[PDB]
């Protein structure tokens, strides 16, 4: 045809059926789904709703505070960046012989959010007691309505596939107890949460309120001066995020001791090196807080690296990786016609009104 | 040294919000500073008085300076065309930074942008010519009226522009 | 009659045609248009010549000059203004925007601000997300099934 750049892949017309994805056991073939989702291939609208609901039902039966046992590979924000997720599974290990703990934010920012849901949920069905998924602050409607996940679901599939995701995201667990030493949340602490019994008796399955214990778990951040506390006070208001609180070092270095915890493993914040270890708790010599970011070259602009965090044999291994190539999309998933017409409408009028300048 | 300063009295729908002082860098960028200062006084007929801020993205910038179309596609420079990228001496430090928008290399017009965060990815691609001297509280206020789209809910406008020293 | 303009409207544009005519042939060439200030810094100049050609010869004569600028009047309509806007994305006029034609028109506007591999990717997708019939190209039925709502037509107006 008239196709100029021929070497670039053409997205397959064929939408995968219930027979091609699933099996007679009900176990989905992840490797057949992977290579398709990488070529920008979509799924049959009903099998996309089947991967979500079957996987949502598996997350419902799971509790508020999951009890993860070592060895685990802890991941942070994946943020739509699917092509960077495929690389994460390579640095961290195959989902068969490796246990996983994702801290949240699979959706928004990156223009491949739905693929990150479909693969992780397909992995959740096949490996329920191995692959563990938590809840990040972007797994709510208000942040997907405002950001790019709603506009993704409308365009790639339907608004009903969005309502499938929204129902599944509420079934996602808030925290994780990794090897009786680590508390794993997305953001961090809450002043309304003193002990671990304050996380267990919470009404999940709802949309995160503007305040409250559920909000503070997914939204909280540490002070920018985490270590140098000239101005004390445990919990101050989070000016950077808008809602929620800020937690200082003595706010963490008291939650730990009060619950016999070693350190808190979070994500939420963008880290240049892909992680960040904060001030050591002078009881153990281990960092009181570690942030882990799994989205490299976040927004194709900050040239940040991404790291994964694997804990095996009483050793914490922080493995760093770089950005992998991905397909282009215009903002809000708009088509070239909607993007180019406002420019044509003026660059034709600024030509014709400038042809009447001579006389 | 003897650098020209200009102002912007922001108006939300019609009612005043406050002024923003802009120190221009005639020392680093001579032509580009004069292209802002000339439209800030309005000494060529067309100016920044009665202008719209079309794209406003939080944690990024405040794009404005489009009067021939107000949607983003228009605007014209004081050189009667669209000038060349002067130089990329000054970088995007962080908040307060005022830089030139463009349609690519050597396509500089009347459109600019005020930064609300560190924007180092735009270095060597956009010509920086000014910083906010006073009135950073007014810029942080304009910011919260935007979105991911860049769309302004309540139409933000500039209605009073001039010059100080 | 299917034309637009009247008496004093055609008479005023006849004074503007002799000034544009350097060689006074009666037909405006492309090398006659690109001598003006705000035209050498406009990507779609060659387009508002190839479409303004009812015969196709490189020169925009006085019949085509009155009929072309006629769609840019306050007396123009919806089905008409988007028809001309459709003919921008179509360089050969076969009434069907092919895969690589869209690429060429966009590069005229975007250029090197998007990498070669990037523009083709969004083109292959704009077609898959709008070509309902599956012909591999976009007609005026499908183009309107997308943009006929943003209403850019209310701004495609100049004065007589």
């Amino acid at each position: 045809t008239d196709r100029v750049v021929k070497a670039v892949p053409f997205p397959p017309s064929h939408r995968l059926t219930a027979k091609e994805v699933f099996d007679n056991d009900g176990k989905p073939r992840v490797d057949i789904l992977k290579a398709h989702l990488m070529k920008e291939g979509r799924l049959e609208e009903s099998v996309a709703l089947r991967i979500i609901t079957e996987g949502a039902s598996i997350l419902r039966q799971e509790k508020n505070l999951l009890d993860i046992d070592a060895p685990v590979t802890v991941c942070g924000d994946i943020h739509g960046q699917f092509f960077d997720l495929m690389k994460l599974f390579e640095v961290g290990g195959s989902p068969a012989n490796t246990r996983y703990l994702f801290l949240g934010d699979y959706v928004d920012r990156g223009y491949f959010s739905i693929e990150c849901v479909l693969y992780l949920w397909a992995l959740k069905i096949l490996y329920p007691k191995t692959l563990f998924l938590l809840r990040g602050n972007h797994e709510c409607r208000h942040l997907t309505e405002y950001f790019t996940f709603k506009q993704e679901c409308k365009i790639k599939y339907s608004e009903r596939v969005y309502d499938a995701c929204m129902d599944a995201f509420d079934c996602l667990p808030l925290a994780a107890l990794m090897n009786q030493q680590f508390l794993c949340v997305h953001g961090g602490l809450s002043p309304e949460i003193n002990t671990l019994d304050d996380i267990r008796k919470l009404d999940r399955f709802k949309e995160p309120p503007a305040y409250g214990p559920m909000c503070d778990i997914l939204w909280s951040d540490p002070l920018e001066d985490f270590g140098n506390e000239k101005t004390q006070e445990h919990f101050t208001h989070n000016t950077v995020r808008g809602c929620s609180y800020f937690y200082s070092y003595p706010a963490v270095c008291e939650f730990l001791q009060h619950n016999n915890l070693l350190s808190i493993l979070r994500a939420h914040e963008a880290q240049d090196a892909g992680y960040r270890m904060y001030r050591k708790s002078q009881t153990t010599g281990f960092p009181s807080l570690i942030t882990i970011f799994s989205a490299p070259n976040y927004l194709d602009v900050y040239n940040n690296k991404a790291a994964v965090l694997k804990y095996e044999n009483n050793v914490m291994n922080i493995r760093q990786f770089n950005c992998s190539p991905h397909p282009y999309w215009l903002p809000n998933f708009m088509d070239v016609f909607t993007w180019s017409l406002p420019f044509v409408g003026e660059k034709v009028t600024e030509m014709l009104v400038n042809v009447l300048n001579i006389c | 040294m003897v650098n020209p300063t200009v102002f912007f009295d922001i108006a939300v729908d019609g009612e005043p919000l406050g002024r923003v002082s802009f120190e221009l860098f005639a020392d680093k960028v001579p032509k580009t500073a004069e292209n802002f200062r000339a439209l800030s006084t309005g000494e060529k007929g067309f100016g920044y008085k009665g202008s719209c801020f079309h794209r406003i993205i939080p944690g990024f910038m405040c794009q404005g300076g489009d009067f021939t179309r107000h949607n983003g596609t228009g605007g014209k420079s004081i050189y009667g065309e669209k000038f060349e990228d002067e130089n990329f001496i000054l970088k995007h430090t962080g908040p307060g930074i005022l830089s030139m928008a463009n349609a690519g290399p050597n396509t500089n017009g009347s459109q600019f942008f005020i930064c609300t965060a560190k924007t180092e990815w735009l270095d060597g691609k956009h010509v920086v010519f000014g910083k906010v001297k006073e009135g950073m509280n007014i810029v942080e206020a304009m910011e919260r009226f935007g979105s991911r789209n860049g769309k302004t809910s309540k139409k933000i406008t500039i209605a009073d522009c001039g010059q100080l020293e | 009659m299917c034309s637009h303009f009247d008496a004093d409207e055609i008479k005023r544009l006849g004074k503007r045609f002799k000034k544009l005519d350097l060689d006074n042939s009666g037909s405006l060439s492309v090398e006659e248009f690109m001598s003006l200030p705000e035209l050498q810094q406009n990507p779609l100049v060659q387009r508002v010549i190839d479409i303004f050609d009812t015969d196709g010869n490189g020169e925009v004569d006085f019949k085509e000059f009155i009929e072309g600028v006629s769609q840019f009047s306050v007396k123009g309509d919806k089905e008409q203004k988007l028809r001309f806007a459709f003919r921008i994305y179509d360089m050969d006029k076969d009434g069907y925007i092919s895969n690589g034609e869209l690429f060429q028109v966009l590069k005229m506007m975007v250029g090197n601000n998007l990498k070669d591999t990037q523009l083709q990717q969004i083109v292959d997708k704009t077609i898959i997300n709008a070509d309902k019939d599956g012909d591999g190209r976009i007609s005026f039925e499908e183009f309107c099934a997308v943009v006929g709502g943003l209403d850019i037509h209310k701004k495609m107006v100049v004065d007589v």
Binding site: - | A101, Q111 | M109
Partner: peptide, 11 residues
């Protein structure tokens, strides 16, 4: 992404 153009706004 995060760009400031005049006419064709990119990713």
């Amino acid at each position: 992404x995060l760009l400031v153009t005049a006419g064709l706004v990119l990713a």
